């Protein structure tokens, strides 16, 4: 058993959009805008939706980019995590309830204060690589295990 989640990265020739997370789930960390995919909503809507909720930003069209699963010790659900991307957005980022918004150049991206997983597959969205991923976690800071791969399809 799985739960879905999404994950938006608007990424732009020289920088890439990242949202502070201000509480809750991953609270103190960049991440890129996303959660919960609904019962009535398709992946990519909740995408669109919790870009929305949580940066006030449109987009015209969402890229499949990656996959990655997330197994955390002692929880029985496994995270199931549609990465996206894109580079044409609509409107200017703003702060929510849930992220702070803020532009980051490519050789800037501040990996100590994002997911560790992060630093694995994070630069193979910014080569423009489609990836599978699986990590294992004890607790949110330490990965036990963790697969890697580029894909044809995500
Ligand atoms: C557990 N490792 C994670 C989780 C994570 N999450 C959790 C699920 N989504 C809401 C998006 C944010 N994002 C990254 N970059 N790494």
Not at 79 to 90: A, E, G, L
Not at 108 to 114: G, L, S, V
Request: charged letters at 25%; proline letters at 5%; aromatic letters at 12%.
């Amino acid at each position: 058993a799985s739960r879905l989640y999404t994950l938006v990265l608007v990424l732009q020739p020289q920088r890439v959009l990242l949202g502070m997370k201000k509480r809750g789930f991953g609270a103190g960390r960049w991440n890129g805008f996303g959660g919960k995919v609904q019962e009535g909503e398709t992946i990519e809507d909740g995408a669109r939706r919790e870009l929305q909720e949580e940066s006030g930003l449109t987009v015209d069209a969402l890229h499949k980019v990656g996959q990655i699963v997330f197994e955390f010790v002692g929880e029985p659900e496994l995270m199931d995590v549609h990465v996206f991307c894109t580079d044409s957005i609509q409107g200017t980022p703003v702060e929510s309830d849930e992220m702070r918004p803020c532009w980051f150049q490519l050789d800037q991206i501040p990996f100590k204060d994002m997911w560790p997983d992060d630093s694995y597959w994070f630069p193979l969205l910014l080569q423009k690589k489609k990836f599978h991923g699986y990590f294992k976690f004890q607790g949110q800071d330490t990965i036990l295990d963790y697969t890697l791969r580029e894909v044809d399809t995500v």
